[PDB]
Amino acid sequence: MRKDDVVIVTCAITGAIHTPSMSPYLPVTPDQIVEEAVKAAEAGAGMVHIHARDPKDGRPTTDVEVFRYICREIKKQSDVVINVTTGGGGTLGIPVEERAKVVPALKPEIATFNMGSMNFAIHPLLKKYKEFKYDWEPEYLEMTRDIVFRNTFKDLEALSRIFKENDTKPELECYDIGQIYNTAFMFHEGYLEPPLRLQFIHGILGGIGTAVEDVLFMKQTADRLIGRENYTWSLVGAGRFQMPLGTLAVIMGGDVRVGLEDSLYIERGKLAKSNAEQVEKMVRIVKELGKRPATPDEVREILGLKGKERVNF
Amino acid sequence: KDDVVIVTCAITGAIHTPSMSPYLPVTPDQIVEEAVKAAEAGAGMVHIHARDPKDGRPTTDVEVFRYICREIKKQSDVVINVTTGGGGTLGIPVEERAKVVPALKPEIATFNMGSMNFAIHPLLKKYKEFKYDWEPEYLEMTRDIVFRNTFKDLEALSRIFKENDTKPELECYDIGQIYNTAFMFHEGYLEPPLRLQFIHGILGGIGTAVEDVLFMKQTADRLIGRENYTWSLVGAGRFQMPLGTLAVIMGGDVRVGLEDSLYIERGKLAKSNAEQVEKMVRIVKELGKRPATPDEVREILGLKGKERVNF
Amino acid sequence: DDVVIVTCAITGAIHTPSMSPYLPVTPDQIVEEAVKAAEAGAGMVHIHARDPKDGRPTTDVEVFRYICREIKKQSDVVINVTTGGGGTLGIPVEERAKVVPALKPEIATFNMGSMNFAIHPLLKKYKEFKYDWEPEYLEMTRDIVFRNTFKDLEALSRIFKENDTKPELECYDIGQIYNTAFMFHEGYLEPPLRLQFIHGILGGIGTAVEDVLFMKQTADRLIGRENYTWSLVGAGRFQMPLGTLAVIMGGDVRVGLEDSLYIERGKLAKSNAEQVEKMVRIVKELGKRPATPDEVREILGLKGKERVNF
Amino acid sequence: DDVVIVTCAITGAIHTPSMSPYLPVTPDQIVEEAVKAAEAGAGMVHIHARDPKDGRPTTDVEVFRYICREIKKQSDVVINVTTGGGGTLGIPVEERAKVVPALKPEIATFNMGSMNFAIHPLLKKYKEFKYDWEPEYLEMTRDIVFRNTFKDLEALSRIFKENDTKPELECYDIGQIYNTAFMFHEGYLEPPLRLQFIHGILGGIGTAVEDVLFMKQTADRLIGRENYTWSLVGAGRFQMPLGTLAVIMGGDVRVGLEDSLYIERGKLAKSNAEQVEKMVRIVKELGKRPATPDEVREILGLKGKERVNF
Ligand SMILES: [Zn+2]
Ligand SMILES: [Zn+2]
Ligand SMILES: [Zn+2]
Ligand SMILES: [Zn+2]
């Protein structure tokens, strides 16, 4: 049972979708990711969501030593909840058993747990960006035209066990209705321990879109398959749907995720200068609606997390 | 008129295995006989997979397809809808599975609209004894096989279908795949009017709630346009007749068959594909409608004719 | 969940005699049609009274008494008495409710809000009427509220309890489900509730699949799936499609000449039984079966045929 | 698709004077609050009249005349005049409509069905009233129909047209959207239509996100996306979240002490402007801005401030 006026704001710092040449404010190096996470926390993000990128050229990497560095350095400066991706790399065809290695290495409090195999395509960005600092960038974007983001039921069974072994909470990423169905199945099969934490992700080419209809239907599907008393949820709107759909989520009693991982913009046609800028905006809206951002320790109590110092970094 | 319903019958598929029902058609001759029976019962279109004649194992073998399609056409003017999905749950990619279309040049063929989990390993808790070793191996392997249909695959497939004058039947198992369909349509790969099929109840896809069906259809109206497509629905298993009837109430078309359910009623095996067709036709008729003849299927879906297929 | 309650609504107050020679008008016609409906598989029949002389709707509790007495002599069917009939003539709940103490039925209708309820467009479809009352009645629905205020509802809730009569809570709109939830949460309506969704009335919600799903979802969300069961009425040509929909969704269904005069497009239904026979064929194709009257009593927790006051 | 019409409903007929010292009740109070709302970014203000001495709701056209004249002297704000006010005292449309011929406003409310409209539960929250009329009024609404029959609406449509006043079509339920669809198709209502969805009245549709979306979808499906525009009213604590939802969905929004006495839970709004300022802040965070009164006129096709009869 949680307070009806406290909203968890998550800030997704860099991701794997956007590339350096798309915005000079996309955090690329590990130290940039660290500083932007700490700034996001100080702006009201009770949780930060972390991917690694190669410092030399910003290319996505699964390297757990880069994760280890980033997470340790954030923890030195902040009590923010550090949520680690196990999805990062998937758009480069990297399997779950390799993506998942960050969980036993770092034993984070919470990490992402993607709930189905899907197309996950950003090749259309090649129409929008013509020149790139690095050769890897347009190659990466093109290759997503034929790469499956793979998360089979066999993968998910093994992942559920890995999370339990390292006392890591799954944040169950759902990009379509079928993936909520997948979530219900794994829950009812005993693999996922309640209360579940779901995140609804809207606007991926290969997933569900960004209509108000889509958001409502996702949440109602979770209510009816899983049961309201058995889960909490957050939402991501891609790109310019970040603030409108995030606001919808809050109105519906959900939590919200913002961050340069999901959108490079602060307004129509205006690049966000930092993660903190989007966090400050969403906090202003949360407060107009008579709510407030959760502190990191509130996030821990709300999601039942193990504690900032019970991690392996 | 809004009083004609296309009733499609999916004869064997690739999900059910022989040991699950002695009435699942296995051999090429069984599949032919059953298709022709389904047609005579009011299925204006039949949907065909191939199986290894020896043991029923799904196969892409084009020469089995050719034999089956040739033999159906010799007995019936039924519209023959060929799979390019069969083999997908064994990890065979679109490039291989699509070769039936340039070979046979069918009037219509299936065209799966996204990559997904497609899992039937739970069937192992229901069936313990199998005539063939391949059957439980296959069920188990689906726990870890992606039914792969990437945007690259789909661009290639769109061209293959156009090059052979084969209409795509766009199989959508989830809301995301209707979004994928809208993308491919707007990009210019898929020619309108589109033919969609909503498939409910696959582990890895959307479920079988009335909510699910309505939302799929509303998503197509909203992204594609109510005028720019027609649609059919498949309800897996015991949801076959109720969801098929729902589709009819909603102005859609319906698909039945042993590919999709082994049963005629809770606990009772269907003895043929024709039995399920006869039932659905009775339901259609009580709702004031009638099944489409094959030639009405051709008119409604803009198909080339049986004279122009390569069998 | 393989039993469906099929109700047959025998005559109502909306259709008038000159619209169809098959609409039951006299008390004896209504009785006989109710009995045939029951024999066709309707476990419950729904009754309105009409004037024997010209078929004008009437609330006369003594006409109700004759009709219900005579049905019960011939059949164990559950007899559902209207407390809505007369409402489209401007007659308020206080008068319409008098049937409940008079007859103490097992179940009676209980309408869940005030609304416009207009059938004046029927004057565009029928230009010749045997009786002067028919077109005057139709025209006056243009300016008559079907009145069921919260005061009315509170009084009615008590009247039903005093007579051990189960409410069948008639909802014609989403607002009326909200009213139901209110009356339930306030303590006036004893669960489990029986609701009926009425689709197609001008002044009410329409006949889209969307409308039906949204009504049922609204009740699930406000009242709770565990706290109610439901039936559906589709008006006119929507009778069979929406009824079939309701069965697919796990609801019960109501048919009858009260709700539609037709058996198919352009063809008058020759009797209530014709409609029940057809809905029963559909129910059976969907692997279900009609509830017998005693199954209806068990499902809805009804007091039994011997405990009524007729 | 970046301009949002923010309407402020200054006083209404639901809340009573003793519920908040900040509810405007005298004519001059109403004028002053209307101007402050306009200055805060309300391009339109919605006006009811109240008795100058006891604050009771009143239809008196000469009170409306003074109020609207005095507002227009100070502000070019668009003045929306109620034809619903008095309905909860049982006053019928024919009487409530007289303000339209008298004042020929640019825009006026046009309520789209008969309904329960009950505020007796306010007696649980407010125990002391300065006037006897206040608790009496609230209790009586338990048993008063808010009457708006099809005959009424036919008459009202001619009145609006005769005075070159745009109908703002108030829908409190799904059936009322169906009613709007009918009156449109019958030729009574001139497109493009202006609808307003009212959420939270006891007797109407509630305040769920589901309710809002289903109202808007029904209007799209029945009337056509291109044939209407819409505004939304969330009652009470739902004012801001539902108004924000409306903005997200492309709709316009109404605030004001008519609909909520509060600026935040447990904190009384000290003025209409306080609610307007808040909504306007929310609009701007969502990358939009409030309409000026002249933009309201252009967006809705209003005749202009110089063409009213005050
Ligand atoms: Zn991520
Ligand atoms: Zn198939
Ligand atoms: Zn009745
Ligand atoms: Zn008002």
PDB file of C-alpha atoms in Angstrom, chain C residues 20-241:
ATOM      1  CA  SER C  20     -47.977  -5.894 -35.796  1.00  0.00           C
ATOM      2  CA  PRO C  21     -50.960  -8.252 -35.467  1.00  0.00           C
ATOM      3  CA  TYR C  22     -48.628 -10.561 -33.522  1.00  0.00           C
ATOM      4  CA  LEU C  23     -48.046  -8.112 -30.618  1.00  0.00           C
ATOM      5  CA  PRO C  24     -49.927  -9.587 -27.662  1.00  0.00           C
ATOM      6  CA  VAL C  25     -52.596  -7.201 -26.455  1.00  0.00           C
ATOM      7  CA  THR C  26     -55.168  -8.891 -24.331  1.00  0.00           C
ATOM      8  CA  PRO C  27     -54.471 -10.459 -20.935  1.00  0.00           C
ATOM      9  CA  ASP C  28     -55.139 -13.933 -22.366  1.00  0.00           C
ATOM     10  CA  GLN C  29     -52.838 -13.329 -25.352  1.00  0.00           C
ATOM     11  CA  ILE C  30     -50.108 -12.254 -22.990  1.00  0.00           C
ATOM     12  CA  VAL C  31     -50.631 -15.388 -20.816  1.00  0.00           C
ATOM     13  CA  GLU C  32     -50.574 -17.779 -23.737  1.00  0.00           C
ATOM     14  CA  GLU C  33     -47.514 -16.182 -25.279  1.00  0.00           C
ATOM     15  CA  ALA C  34     -45.688 -16.324 -21.928  1.00  0.00           C
ATOM     16  CA  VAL C  35     -46.465 -20.016 -21.596  1.00  0.00           C
ATOM     17  CA  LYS C  36     -45.268 -20.756 -25.195  1.00  0.00           C
ATOM     18  CA  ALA C  37     -42.135 -18.685 -24.585  1.00  0.00           C
ATOM     19  CA  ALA C  38     -41.392 -20.760 -21.469  1.00  0.00           C
ATOM     20  CA  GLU C  39     -41.940 -24.020 -23.419  1.00  0.00           C
ATOM     21  CA  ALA C  40     -39.513 -22.703 -26.070  1.00  0.00           C
ATOM     22  CA  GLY C  41     -36.741 -22.395 -23.395  1.00  0.00           C
ATOM     23  CA  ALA C  42     -37.257 -18.964 -21.729  1.00  0.00           C
ATOM     24  CA  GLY C  43     -36.663 -19.640 -18.016  1.00  0.00           C
ATOM     25  CA  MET C  44     -38.007 -16.148 -17.209  1.00  0.00           C
ATOM     26  CA  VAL C  45     -40.761 -14.109 -18.891  1.00  0.00           C
ATOM     27  CA  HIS C  46     -41.178 -10.371 -18.563  1.00  0.00           C
ATOM     28  CA  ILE C  47     -44.673  -8.947 -18.249  1.00  0.00           C
ATOM     29  CA  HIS C  48     -46.430  -5.655 -18.872  1.00  0.00           C
ATOM     30  CA  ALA C  49     -50.205  -5.039 -18.686  1.00  0.00           C
ATOM     31  CA  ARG C  50     -52.284  -3.548 -21.490  1.00  0.00           C
ATOM     32  CA  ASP C  51     -55.925  -2.522 -21.682  1.00  0.00           C
ATOM     33  CA  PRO C  52     -57.973  -5.500 -22.990  1.00  0.00           C
ATOM     34  CA  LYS C  53     -60.057  -3.179 -25.215  1.00  0.00           C
ATOM     35  CA  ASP C  54     -57.391  -1.363 -27.273  1.00  0.00           C
ATOM     36  CA  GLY C  55     -53.976  -2.392 -26.046  1.00  0.00           C
ATOM     37  CA  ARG C  56     -53.112   0.914 -24.330  1.00  0.00           C
ATOM     38  CA  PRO C  57     -50.433   0.454 -21.658  1.00  0.00           C
ATOM     39  CA  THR C  58     -51.893   0.314 -18.169  1.00  0.00           C
ATOM     40  CA  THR C  59     -50.405  -0.104 -14.669  1.00  0.00           C
ATOM     41  CA  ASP C  60     -53.649  -1.737 -13.341  1.00  0.00           C
ATOM     42  CA  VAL C  61     -52.458  -4.130 -10.648  1.00  0.00           C
ATOM     43  CA  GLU C  62     -55.622  -6.250 -11.149  1.00  0.00           C
ATOM     44  CA  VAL C  63     -54.739  -6.924 -14.801  1.00  0.00           C
ATOM     45  CA  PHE C  64     -51.239  -7.871 -13.649  1.00  0.00           C
ATOM     46  CA  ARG C  65     -52.798 -10.151 -11.066  1.00  0.00           C
ATOM     47  CA  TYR C  66     -54.912 -12.020 -13.633  1.00  0.00           C
ATOM     48  CA  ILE C  67     -52.054 -12.388 -16.115  1.00  0.00           C
ATOM     49  CA  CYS C  68     -49.541 -13.666 -13.526  1.00  0.00           C
ATOM     50  CA  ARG C  69     -52.019 -15.947 -11.808  1.00  0.00           C
ATOM     51  CA  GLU C  70     -52.932 -17.577 -15.096  1.00  0.00           C
ATOM     52  CA  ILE C  71     -49.326 -18.012 -16.242  1.00  0.00           C
ATOM     53  CA  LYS C  72     -48.427 -19.632 -12.903  1.00  0.00           C
ATOM     54  CA  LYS C  73     -51.359 -22.097 -13.278  1.00  0.00           C
ATOM     55  CA  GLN C  74     -49.780 -23.356 -16.514  1.00  0.00           C
ATOM     56  CA  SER C  75     -46.036 -22.918 -16.002  1.00  0.00           C
ATOM     57  CA  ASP C  76     -43.267 -22.809 -13.399  1.00  0.00           C
ATOM     58  CA  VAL C  77     -41.562 -20.019 -15.427  1.00  0.00           C
ATOM     59  CA  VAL C  78     -40.087 -17.134 -13.387  1.00  0.00           C
ATOM     60  CA  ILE C  79     -42.478 -14.167 -13.877  1.00  0.00           C
ATOM     61  CA  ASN C  80     -40.673 -10.830 -13.994  1.00  0.00           C
ATOM     62  CA  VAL C  81     -43.105  -7.916 -13.464  1.00  0.00           C
ATOM     63  CA  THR C  82     -42.342  -4.428 -14.859  1.00  0.00           C
ATOM     64  CA  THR C  83     -42.216  -1.382 -12.621  1.00  0.00           C
ATOM     65  CA  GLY C  84     -41.160   0.626 -15.727  1.00  0.00           C
ATOM     66  CA  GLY C  85     -44.423   0.286 -17.715  1.00  0.00           C
ATOM     67  CA  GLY C  86     -46.400   3.571 -17.735  1.00  0.00           C
ATOM     68  CA  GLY C  87     -43.208   5.604 -17.452  1.00  0.00           C
ATOM     69  CA  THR C  88     -43.333   6.670 -21.121  1.00  0.00           C
ATOM     70  CA  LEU C  89     -46.839   7.966 -20.367  1.00  0.00           C
ATOM     71  CA  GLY C  90     -45.536  10.144 -17.547  1.00  0.00           C
ATOM     72  CA  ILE C  91     -46.638   7.846 -14.698  1.00  0.00           C
ATOM     73  CA  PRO C  92     -44.146   8.026 -11.759  1.00  0.00           C
ATOM     74  CA  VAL C  93     -42.467   5.263  -9.738  1.00  0.00           C
ATOM     75  CA  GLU C  94     -44.864   5.659  -6.782  1.00  0.00           C
ATOM     76  CA  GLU C  95     -47.796   4.492  -8.925  1.00  0.00           C
ATOM     77  CA  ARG C  96     -45.874   1.966 -11.073  1.00  0.00           C
ATOM     78  CA  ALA C  97     -44.432   0.340  -7.966  1.00  0.00           C
ATOM     79  CA  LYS C  98     -47.875  -0.722  -6.617  1.00  0.00           C
ATOM     80  CA  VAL C  99     -47.648  -4.085  -8.434  1.00  0.00           C
ATOM     81  CA  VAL C 100     -44.829  -5.153  -6.083  1.00  0.00           C
ATOM     82  CA  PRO C 101     -46.853  -5.129  -2.840  1.00  0.00           C
ATOM     83  CA  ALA C 102     -49.949  -6.397  -4.697  1.00  0.00           C
ATOM     84  CA  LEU C 103     -48.312  -9.456  -6.274  1.00  0.00           C
ATOM     85  CA  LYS C 104     -45.030  -9.934  -4.329  1.00  0.00           C
ATOM     86  CA  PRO C 105     -43.268 -11.358  -7.413  1.00  0.00           C
ATOM     87  CA  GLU C 106     -39.960 -13.218  -7.311  1.00  0.00           C
ATOM     88  CA  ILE C 107     -38.338 -10.514  -9.460  1.00  0.00           C
ATOM     89  CA  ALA C 108     -39.372  -7.155 -10.964  1.00  0.00           C
ATOM     90  CA  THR C 109     -37.709  -4.482 -13.022  1.00  0.00           C
ATOM     91  CA  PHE C 110     -36.088  -1.522 -11.238  1.00  0.00           C
ATOM     92  CA  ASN C 111     -35.119   1.317 -13.535  1.00  0.00           C
ATOM     93  CA  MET C 112     -31.943   3.167 -12.562  1.00  0.00           C
ATOM     94  CA  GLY C 113     -32.363   6.730 -13.693  1.00  0.00           C
ATOM     95  CA  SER C 114     -34.362   9.534 -15.244  1.00  0.00           C
ATOM     96  CA  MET C 115     -34.004   9.902 -19.025  1.00  0.00           C
ATOM     97  CA  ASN C 116     -35.615  10.965 -22.273  1.00  0.00           C
ATOM     98  CA  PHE C 117     -37.205   7.844 -23.837  1.00  0.00           C
ATOM     99  CA  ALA C 118     -38.611   8.891 -27.177  1.00  0.00           C
ATOM    100  CA  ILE C 119     -40.374   6.814 -29.863  1.00  0.00           C
ATOM    101  CA  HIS C 120     -41.961   9.677 -31.840  1.00  0.00           C
ATOM    102  CA  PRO C 121     -39.876   8.785 -34.950  1.00  0.00           C
ATOM    103  CA  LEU C 122     -42.040   5.614 -35.263  1.00  0.00           C
ATOM    104  CA  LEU C 123     -44.670   8.042 -36.691  1.00  0.00           C
ATOM    105  CA  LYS C 124     -42.495   8.219 -39.815  1.00  0.00           C
ATOM    106  CA  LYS C 125     -42.759   4.488 -40.247  1.00  0.00           C
ATOM    107  CA  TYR C 126     -46.464   3.925 -39.446  1.00  0.00           C
ATOM    108  CA  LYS C 127     -49.155   6.122 -40.958  1.00  0.00           C
ATOM    109  CA  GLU C 128     -52.346   4.152 -40.209  1.00  0.00           C
ATOM    110  CA  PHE C 129     -53.398   3.211 -36.698  1.00  0.00           C
ATOM    111  CA  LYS C 130     -56.556   1.406 -35.644  1.00  0.00           C
ATOM    112  CA  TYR C 131     -56.780   3.535 -32.476  1.00  0.00           C
ATOM    113  CA  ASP C 132     -56.438   7.264 -31.817  1.00  0.00           C
ATOM    114  CA  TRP C 133     -54.390   6.543 -28.680  1.00  0.00           C
ATOM    115  CA  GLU C 134     -51.484   5.040 -30.685  1.00  0.00           C
ATOM    116  CA  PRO C 135     -50.134   8.127 -32.513  1.00  0.00           C
ATOM    117  CA  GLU C 136     -50.954  10.424 -29.571  1.00  0.00           C
ATOM    118  CA  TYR C 137     -48.923   8.106 -27.349  1.00  0.00           C
ATOM    119  CA  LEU C 138     -45.951   8.058 -29.771  1.00  0.00           C
ATOM    120  CA  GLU C 139     -45.978  11.844 -30.204  1.00  0.00           C
ATOM    121  CA  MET C 140     -46.167  12.543 -26.500  1.00  0.00           C
ATOM    122  CA  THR C 141     -42.991  10.540 -25.760  1.00  0.00           C
ATOM    123  CA  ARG C 142     -41.247  13.489 -27.463  1.00  0.00           C
ATOM    124  CA  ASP C 143     -41.936  15.498 -24.265  1.00  0.00           C
ATOM    125  CA  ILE C 144     -42.166  12.923 -21.446  1.00  0.00           C
ATOM    126  CA  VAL C 145     -39.363  12.102 -19.051  1.00  0.00           C
ATOM    127  CA  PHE C 146     -39.045   8.493 -17.968  1.00  0.00           C
ATOM    128  CA  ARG C 147     -38.711   9.515 -14.342  1.00  0.00           C
ATOM    129  CA  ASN C 148     -36.686   7.611 -11.771  1.00  0.00           C
ATOM    130  CA  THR C 149     -35.183  10.007  -9.318  1.00  0.00           C
ATOM    131  CA  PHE C 150     -32.840   9.067  -6.468  1.00  0.00           C
ATOM    132  CA  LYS C 151     -35.772   9.584  -4.079  1.00  0.00           C
ATOM    133  CA  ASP C 152     -37.852   7.203  -6.179  1.00  0.00           C
ATOM    134  CA  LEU C 153     -35.029   4.650  -6.137  1.00  0.00           C
ATOM    135  CA  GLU C 154     -34.556   4.776  -2.360  1.00  0.00           C
ATOM    136  CA  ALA C 155     -38.322   4.191  -1.839  1.00  0.00           C
ATOM    137  CA  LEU C 156     -38.356   1.412  -4.418  1.00  0.00           C
ATOM    138  CA  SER C 157     -35.399  -0.333  -2.804  1.00  0.00           C
ATOM    139  CA  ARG C 158     -37.382  -0.549   0.383  1.00  0.00           C
ATOM    140  CA  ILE C 159     -40.577  -1.654  -1.357  1.00  0.00           C
ATOM    141  CA  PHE C 160     -38.663  -4.525  -3.002  1.00  0.00           C
ATOM    142  CA  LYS C 161     -37.215  -5.639   0.320  1.00  0.00           C
ATOM    143  CA  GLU C 162     -40.557  -5.461   2.103  1.00  0.00           C
ATOM    144  CA  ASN C 163     -42.053  -7.871  -0.508  1.00  0.00           C
ATOM    145  CA  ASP C 164     -39.040 -10.210  -0.927  1.00  0.00           C
ATOM    146  CA  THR C 165     -38.791  -9.232  -4.593  1.00  0.00           C
ATOM    147  CA  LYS C 166     -35.353  -9.293  -6.303  1.00  0.00           C
ATOM    148  CA  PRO C 167     -34.495  -6.131  -8.268  1.00  0.00           C
ATOM    149  CA  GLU C 168     -33.509  -6.489 -11.908  1.00  0.00           C
ATOM    150  CA  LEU C 169     -31.709  -3.193 -12.307  1.00  0.00           C
ATOM    151  CA  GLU C 170     -32.337  -1.726 -15.711  1.00  0.00           C
ATOM    152  CA  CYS C 171     -29.484   0.457 -17.023  1.00  0.00           C
ATOM    153  CA  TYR C 172     -29.834   2.379 -20.276  1.00  0.00           C
ATOM    154  CA  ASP C 173     -26.574   4.355 -20.042  1.00  0.00           C
ATOM    155  CA  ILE C 174     -23.205   4.545 -18.283  1.00  0.00           C
ATOM    156  CA  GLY C 175     -24.529   7.161 -15.840  1.00  0.00           C
ATOM    157  CA  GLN C 176     -27.161   4.604 -14.735  1.00  0.00           C
ATOM    158  CA  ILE C 177     -24.397   2.107 -13.844  1.00  0.00           C
ATOM    159  CA  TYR C 178     -22.833   4.924 -11.805  1.00  0.00           C
ATOM    160  CA  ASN C 179     -26.270   5.468 -10.149  1.00  0.00           C
ATOM    161  CA  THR C 180     -26.414   1.720  -9.422  1.00  0.00           C
ATOM    162  CA  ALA C 181     -22.941   1.710  -7.901  1.00  0.00           C
ATOM    163  CA  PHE C 182     -24.025   4.649  -5.706  1.00  0.00           C
ATOM    164  CA  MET C 183     -27.202   2.980  -4.480  1.00  0.00           C
ATOM    165  CA  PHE C 184     -25.256  -0.229  -3.831  1.00  0.00           C
ATOM    166  CA  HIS C 185     -22.466   1.520  -1.915  1.00  0.00           C
ATOM    167  CA  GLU C 186     -25.043   3.516   0.066  1.00  0.00           C
ATOM    168  CA  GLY C 187     -26.668   0.312   1.309  1.00  0.00           C
ATOM    169  CA  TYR C 188     -29.966   0.306  -0.607  1.00  0.00           C
ATOM    170  CA  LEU C 189     -29.282  -2.555  -3.046  1.00  0.00           C
ATOM    171  CA  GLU C 190     -28.385  -6.002  -1.656  1.00  0.00           C
ATOM    172  CA  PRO C 191     -25.775  -8.004  -3.536  1.00  0.00           C
ATOM    173  CA  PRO C 192     -25.347  -9.925  -5.603  1.00  0.00           C
ATOM    174  CA  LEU C 193     -26.922  -7.410  -7.958  1.00  0.00           C
ATOM    175  CA  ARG C 194     -28.747  -8.313 -11.120  1.00  0.00           C
ATOM    176  CA  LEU C 195     -28.285  -5.749 -13.862  1.00  0.00           C
ATOM    177  CA  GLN C 196     -29.656  -5.553 -17.335  1.00  0.00           C
ATOM    178  CA  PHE C 197     -28.064  -3.397 -20.049  1.00  0.00           C
ATOM    179  CA  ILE C 198     -30.622  -1.944 -22.403  1.00  0.00           C
ATOM    180  CA  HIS C 199     -29.182  -0.887 -25.764  1.00  0.00           C
ATOM    181  CA  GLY C 200     -30.849   1.166 -28.509  1.00  0.00           C
ATOM    182  CA  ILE C 201     -33.351   3.541 -26.854  1.00  0.00           C
ATOM    183  CA  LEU C 202     -33.490   7.135 -28.120  1.00  0.00           C
ATOM    184  CA  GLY C 203     -32.431   8.867 -24.904  1.00  0.00           C
ATOM    185  CA  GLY C 204     -30.208   5.918 -23.981  1.00  0.00           C
ATOM    186  CA  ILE C 205     -26.902   4.381 -25.090  1.00  0.00           C
ATOM    187  CA  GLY C 206     -26.824   2.894 -28.609  1.00  0.00           C
ATOM    188  CA  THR C 207     -26.155  -0.549 -30.036  1.00  0.00           C
ATOM    189  CA  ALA C 208     -22.366  -0.579 -30.914  1.00  0.00           C
ATOM    190  CA  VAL C 209     -20.279  -3.531 -29.717  1.00  0.00           C
ATOM    191  CA  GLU C 210     -18.277  -0.696 -28.070  1.00  0.00           C
ATOM    192  CA  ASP C 211     -21.344   0.373 -26.044  1.00  0.00           C
ATOM    193  CA  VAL C 212     -22.023  -3.160 -24.777  1.00  0.00           C
ATOM    194  CA  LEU C 213     -18.424  -3.801 -23.718  1.00  0.00           C
ATOM    195  CA  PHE C 214     -18.182  -0.421 -22.044  1.00  0.00           C
ATOM    196  CA  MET C 215     -21.383  -0.938 -20.025  1.00  0.00           C
ATOM    197  CA  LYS C 216     -20.143  -4.315 -18.743  1.00  0.00           C
ATOM    198  CA  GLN C 217     -16.652  -2.976 -18.000  1.00  0.00           C
ATOM    199  CA  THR C 218     -18.145  -0.029 -16.121  1.00  0.00           C
ATOM    200  CA  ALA C 219     -20.118  -2.441 -13.850  1.00  0.00           C
ATOM    201  CA  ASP C 220     -17.015  -4.586 -13.342  1.00  0.00           C
ATOM    202  CA  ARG C 221     -14.998  -1.570 -12.290  1.00  0.00           C
ATOM    203  CA  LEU C 222     -17.596   0.172 -10.055  1.00  0.00           C
ATOM    204  CA  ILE C 223     -19.459  -2.786  -8.558  1.00  0.00           C
ATOM    205  CA  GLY C 224     -16.992  -5.675  -8.843  1.00  0.00           C
ATOM    206  CA  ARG C 225     -17.234  -8.820 -10.952  1.00  0.00           C
ATOM    207  CA  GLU C 226     -17.973 -10.886  -7.806  1.00  0.00           C
ATOM    208  CA  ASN C 227     -20.999  -8.667  -6.871  1.00  0.00           C
ATOM    209  CA  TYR C 228     -23.292  -8.899  -9.899  1.00  0.00           C
ATOM    210  CA  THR C 229     -24.557 -10.874 -12.819  1.00  0.00           C
ATOM    211  CA  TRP C 230     -26.024  -9.400 -15.946  1.00  0.00           C
ATOM    212  CA  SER C 231     -28.348  -9.668 -18.889  1.00  0.00           C
ATOM    213  CA  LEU C 232     -28.716  -7.590 -22.089  1.00  0.00           C
ATOM    214  CA  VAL C 233     -31.491  -6.309 -24.330  1.00  0.00           C
ATOM    215  CA  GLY C 234     -30.780  -5.186 -27.891  1.00  0.00           C
ATOM    216  CA  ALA C 235     -33.611  -3.188 -29.439  1.00  0.00           C
ATOM    217  CA  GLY C 236     -35.038  -3.993 -32.862  1.00  0.00           C
ATOM    218  CA  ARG C 237     -32.744  -5.605 -35.364  1.00  0.00           C
ATOM    219  CA  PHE C 238     -29.958  -5.582 -32.781  1.00  0.00           C
ATOM    220  CA  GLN C 239     -31.792  -8.160 -30.669  1.00  0.00           C
ATOM    221  CA  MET C 240     -30.012 -11.251 -31.987  1.00  0.00           C
ATOM    222  CA  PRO C 241     -26.554  -9.798 -32.727  1.00  0.00           C
TER     223      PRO C 241
END
